[PDB]
Scaffold this active site. Sequence first.
Site, PDB file in Angstrom:
ATOM      1  N   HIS A  96       0.847  -1.225   0.000  1.00  0.00           N
ATOM      2  CA  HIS A  96       0.000   0.000   0.000  1.00  0.00           C
ATOM      3  C   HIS A  96       0.869   1.258   0.000  1.00  0.00           C
ATOM      4  O   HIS A  96       0.759   2.089   0.912  1.00  0.00           O
ATOM      5  CB  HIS A  96      -0.999  -0.047   1.140  1.00  0.00           C
ATOM      6  CG  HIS A  96      -2.142  -0.965   0.882  1.00  0.00           C
ATOM      7  ND1 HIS A  96      -2.200  -2.232   1.418  1.00  0.00           N
ATOM      8  CD2 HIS A  96      -3.290  -0.790   0.193  1.00  0.00           C
ATOM      9  CE1 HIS A  96      -3.337  -2.802   1.068  1.00  0.00           C
ATOM     10  NE2 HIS A  96      -4.029  -1.932   0.322  1.00  0.00           N
ATOM     11  N   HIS A 115      -5.975   7.512  -3.246  1.00  0.00           N
ATOM     12  CA  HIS A 115      -7.018   6.630  -2.653  1.00  0.00           C
ATOM     13  C   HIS A 115      -6.492   5.852  -1.438  1.00  0.00           C
ATOM     14  O   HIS A 115      -7.350   5.366  -0.664  1.00  0.00           O
ATOM     15  CB  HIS A 115      -7.636   5.702  -3.707  1.00  0.00           C
ATOM     16  CG  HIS A 115      -6.836   4.473  -3.926  1.00  0.00           C
ATOM     17  ND1 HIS A 115      -5.660   4.493  -4.628  1.00  0.00           N
ATOM     18  CD2 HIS A 115      -7.018   3.205  -3.506  1.00  0.00           C
ATOM     19  CE1 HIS A 115      -5.148   3.273  -4.644  1.00  0.00           C
ATOM     20  NE2 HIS A 115      -5.961   2.464  -3.960  1.00  0.00           N
ATOM     21  N   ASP A 116      -5.172   5.676  -1.272  1.00  0.00           N
ATOM     22  CA  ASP A 116      -4.608   4.954  -0.090  1.00  0.00           C
ATOM     23  C   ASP A 116      -3.607   5.838   0.676  1.00  0.00           C
ATOM     24  O   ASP A 116      -2.715   5.279   1.348  1.00  0.00           O
ATOM     25  CB  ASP A 116      -3.955   3.627  -0.481  1.00  0.00           C
ATOM     26  CG  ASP A 116      -4.912   2.450  -0.666  1.00  0.00           C
ATOM     27  OD1 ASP A 116      -5.906   2.339   0.085  1.00  0.00           O
ATOM     28  OD2 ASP A 116      -4.618   1.614  -1.531  1.00  0.00           O
ATOM     29  N   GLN A 128      -6.076 -17.472  -3.444  1.00  0.00           N
ATOM     30  CA  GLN A 128      -6.088 -16.650  -4.696  1.00  0.00           C
ATOM     31  C   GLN A 128      -7.285 -17.051  -5.583  1.00  0.00           C
ATOM     32  O   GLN A 128      -8.036 -16.143  -6.030  1.00  0.00           O
ATOM     33  CB  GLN A 128      -4.738 -16.723  -5.425  1.00  0.00           C
ATOM     34  CG  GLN A 128      -3.647 -15.865  -4.782  1.00  0.00           C
ATOM     35  CD  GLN A 128      -3.948 -14.382  -4.850  1.00  0.00           C
ATOM     36  OE1 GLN A 128      -3.778 -13.733  -5.876  1.00  0.00           O
ATOM     37  NE2 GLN A 128      -4.431 -13.827  -3.752  1.00  0.00           N
TER      38      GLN A 128
HETATM   39  O1  IYW Z   1      -5.012 -11.046  -3.577  1.00  0.00           O
HETATM   40  C1  IYW Z   1      -5.847 -10.708  -2.733  1.00  0.00           C
HETATM   41  C2  IYW Z   1      -6.360 -11.625  -1.764  1.00  0.00           C
HETATM   42  C3  IYW Z   1      -7.314 -11.173  -0.875  1.00  0.00           C
HETATM   43  N1  IYW Z   1      -7.792  -9.891  -0.881  1.00  0.00           N
HETATM   44  C4  IYW Z   1      -8.803  -9.439   0.130  1.00  0.00           C
HETATM   45  C5  IYW Z   1     -10.064 -10.295   0.237  1.00  0.00           C
HETATM   46  C6  IYW Z   1     -10.030 -11.682   0.005  1.00  0.00           C
HETATM   47  C7  IYW Z   1     -11.177 -12.485   0.080  1.00  0.00           C
HETATM   48  C8  IYW Z   1     -12.393 -11.878   0.410  1.00  0.00           C
HETATM   49  C9  IYW Z   1     -12.452 -10.502   0.650  1.00  0.00           C
HETATM   50  C10 IYW Z   1     -11.298  -9.716   0.571  1.00  0.00           C
HETATM   51  N2  IYW Z   1      -7.336  -9.039  -1.762  1.00  0.00           N
HETATM   52  C11 IYW Z   1      -6.404  -9.327  -2.672  1.00  0.00           C
HETATM   53  C12 IYW Z   1      -5.991  -8.280  -3.641  1.00  0.00           C
HETATM   54  C13 IYW Z   1      -5.646  -8.487  -4.954  1.00  0.00           C
HETATM   55  C14 IYW Z   1      -5.361  -7.235  -5.506  1.00  0.00           C
HETATM   56  N3  IYW Z   1      -5.502  -6.307  -4.589  1.00  0.00           N
HETATM   57  N4  IYW Z   1      -5.898  -6.929  -3.412  1.00  0.00           N
HETATM   58  C15 IYW Z   1      -6.137  -6.269  -2.208  1.00  0.00           C
HETATM   59  C16 IYW Z   1      -7.343  -5.589  -2.044  1.00  0.00           C
HETATM   60  C17 IYW Z   1      -7.567  -4.929  -0.845  1.00  0.00           C
HETATM   61  C18 IYW Z   1      -6.621  -4.952   0.182  1.00  0.00           C
HETATM   62  C19 IYW Z   1      -5.424  -5.636   0.011  1.00  0.00           C
HETATM   63  C20 IYW Z   1      -5.184  -6.303  -1.190  1.00  0.00           C
HETATM   64 MG    MG Z   2      -7.528   1.161   0.217  1.00  0.00          MG
HETATM   65 ZN    ZN Z   3      -5.618   0.562  -3.007  1.00  0.00          ZN
END
Ligand code: IYW
Ligand code: MG
Ligand code: ZN
Length: 312
Positions: free
Chosen positions: A67, A105-106, A268
């Site tokens: 982030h 945004h972050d 994933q």
């Molecule tokens: O690979 C990822 C695995 C899980 N999650 C979160 C999540 C998993 C399941 C259910 C709900 C939420 N996010 C990602 C991901 C891919 C790209 N960006 N982000 C991401 C988004 C927000 C924060 C941090 C990372």
């Molecule tokens: Mg964010």
């Molecule tokens: Zn972001």
Amino acid sequence: LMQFTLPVRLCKEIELFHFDIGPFENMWPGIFVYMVHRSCGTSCFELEKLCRFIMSVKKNYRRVPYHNWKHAVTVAHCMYAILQNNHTLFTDLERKGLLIACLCHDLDHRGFSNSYLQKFDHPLAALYSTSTMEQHHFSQTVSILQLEGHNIFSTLSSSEYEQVLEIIRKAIIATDLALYFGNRKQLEEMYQTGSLNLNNQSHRDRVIGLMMTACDLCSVTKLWPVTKLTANDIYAEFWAEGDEMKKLGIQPIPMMDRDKKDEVPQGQLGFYNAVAIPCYTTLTQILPPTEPLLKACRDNLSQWEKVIRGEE
Ligand SMILES: O=c1ccn(Cc2ccccc2)nc1-c1ccnn1-c1ccccc1
Ligand SMILES: [Mg+2]
Ligand SMILES: [Zn+2]
């Protein structure tokens, strides 16, 4: 006038959705200004004010694994690609607002979820009970806009200024993935029943929200080597949060447990199936020229399936 120019490979590849901004930090500001000038116009912002804004925004991103400043510029580039592939769909104020919203945004992210702030009892959890970090990110954006010589919107009327800050607030709040699920369902229904109306402001808001989710998740729409290596940065933060959960005497969800590293490939798949693919599917229905994001996402899903099957 002073137009920004990129080397040939970047000039061409920056137009594509799957562009990676590269490891040269000092080129990212120039890359952002290039995108503003082409997406918005050379007149949208005073170059001196815009450069000063960009460098203050950079300084207010932290040295966290994912982030960080690179995520900010990466998310702004996905928005650039969406706007450039949907030229006529967006207003002058929207093009101005959304690239800035993405860059900001972050702002001041510490690499921790809203959940961890709530369980820690962080002051921000008391100031902002929902979309905790996202209200903070918007707050930091207004703070920087109010620094002397940083008001890139100074030449907007009072009403245009309120409108663009309202576009930015909604765009940044929509990056709360907790809000994405309901937003996409509603857009899914509105599209299916044929009631989706881009002249309805509440409908545009929803569509901008989904674009923000799409740009925010855009790591999953890169070439496999970029997606796979970004996943390491994403999980470095997840595991640190998991560590901090264990320090609070709370067993973290497996996704954040570095002892359960074996479960990442299946995690994933769930994320692609529950979040990413639905997001780019609905986005592609509403904005057909964003199909390459869905195509690239599906390619990465298939790569994670290969990891599970021991084919890598
Ligand atoms: O690979 C990822 C695995 C899980 N999650 C979160 C999540 C998993 C399941 C259910 C709900 C939420 N996010 C990602 C991901 C891919 C790209 N960006 N982000 C991401 C988004 C927000 C924060 C941090 C990372
Ligand atoms: Mg964010
Ligand atoms: Zn972001």
